[PDB]
Amino acid sequence: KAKTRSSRAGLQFPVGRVHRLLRKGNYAERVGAGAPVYLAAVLEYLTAEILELAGNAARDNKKTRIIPRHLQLAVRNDEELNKLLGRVTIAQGGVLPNIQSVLLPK
C-alpha cells in the first residue's frame, strides 16, 4: 500500500506537484524533500485564510458562493492580505465602498 506524501503531512495540496514544479521551475540545482512539504503547507494555509475571509464576506452578503467581489472585499479588508496583495489587481473585484467625509453633505 502506497500512502501519498500529502496524506502523510495531513495536507490537501499535492506535495508531489509542488516538488515537480520546484524541480521543473529550475529554482535551484537541488530540492530537499522537506521544501515541497513546507511550501505546500504554507500555500494551503494561505489558501484557507483567503477562502475563510471570503466565505465570511459571502455570509455577510447572504451569499453561499464565493465570487470575485467577496475575494476583493476579503483581501482589501484584511490588514495583512492587503499588504501581501497591494500590487495585485483582482478581475471583477471592483473596489471597497468608501466615500470621504469631506464629500458627504453637512
Binding site: 470575485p68 489587481t89 478581475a91 471583477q92 473596489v95 465602498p97 468608501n98 466615500i99 464629500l103 453633505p105
Partner: protein, 97 residues
C-alpha cells in the same frame, strides 16, 4: 417639479459604482482603442477576447486607483473638484511621470 441638488445624485452614483463589479467602459469602444494602439507595433494583430478584457480590467482598475489618489490630493488642496494638476501630481508622486 422635484429636483436633486448638485452632488446629491453624485453621492448616489458613487455608492452605485462602488457597489457594482461590472466594467464601466463600453467593451467595443475599448476594444477599438486597443486595436488602434496595437496596430502601431504590428499590423493585423489578433487579440483573444480574454486579452481585451484583461486590458480593460487592468485599465479600469488603474484609472480607478488613480482617481482615488487624484481625489486625495484634490482634498489636500481643500477642493472637491478634481483638476488635471491633481492627476499630474498623483502621477508624479506615484513615480510614473
Amino acid at each position: 417639479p422635484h429636483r436633486y441638488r448638485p452632488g446629491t445624485v453624485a453621492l448616489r452614483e458613487i455608492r452605485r459604482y462602488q457597489k457594482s463589479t461590472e466594467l464601466l467602459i463600453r467593451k467595443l469602444p475599448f476594444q477599438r482603442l486597443v486595436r488602434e494602439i496595437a496596430q502601431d507595433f504590428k499590423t493585423d494583430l489578433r487579440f483573444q477576447s480574454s486579452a481585451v478584457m484583461a486590458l480593460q480590467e487592468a485599465s479600469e482598475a488603474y484609472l480607478v486607483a488613480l482617481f482615488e489618489d487624484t481625489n486625495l490630493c484634490a482634498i489636500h488642496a481643500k477642493r472637491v473638484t478634481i483638476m488635471p494638476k491633481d492627476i499630474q501630481l498623483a502621477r508624479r508622486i506615484r513615480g510614473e511621470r
